[PDB]
Amino acid sequence: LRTPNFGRKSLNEIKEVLAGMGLHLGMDVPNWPPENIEDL
DNA sequence: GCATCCGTGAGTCGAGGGTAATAAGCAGGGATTCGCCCGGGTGTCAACTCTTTTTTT
């Protein structure tokens, strides 16, 4: 919500599509693979 | 009633890989065919106006 044009209806669809992919809010270390070592 | 002459046959699977020779001449007129170019229908882009789903007030 602290971003310009924070889509109220799109924030729910994006969370739904993220949960459908297998990921959710948090559930991991904060920026674990933040380097280029995780690039495939 | 017999003697003489003309058609069909020849197993079946496999290998091995392409070929080869003669050789007139020129004048008339048409049909054919290749280069350039204008062009009109097909694409690829700057650029002017309604609607509305919110995101902001």
A38 CA – B9 C1', rounded, Å: 83
DSSP, res A32:
S
Q: Which nucleotides of B are covered by protein (CB under 7 A)?
A: 53-56
Given a contact cutoff of 8 angstroms between Cβ atoms, the answer to whether A39 and A33 are in contact is no
A10 touches strand B (CB under 7 A): yes
Q: How far out from the chain centre does Cα A21 lie?
A: 11
What ranges in chain A are assigned the alpha helix state H?
A: 10-20
Stated in angstroms to one decimal place, the resolution of this structure is 3.7
Residue A15: partners with Cβ closer than 8 Å, 6 or more residues away: A25
State both tokens at A2.
């602290």
Residue A18: partners with Cβ closer than 8 Å, 6 or more residues away: A24
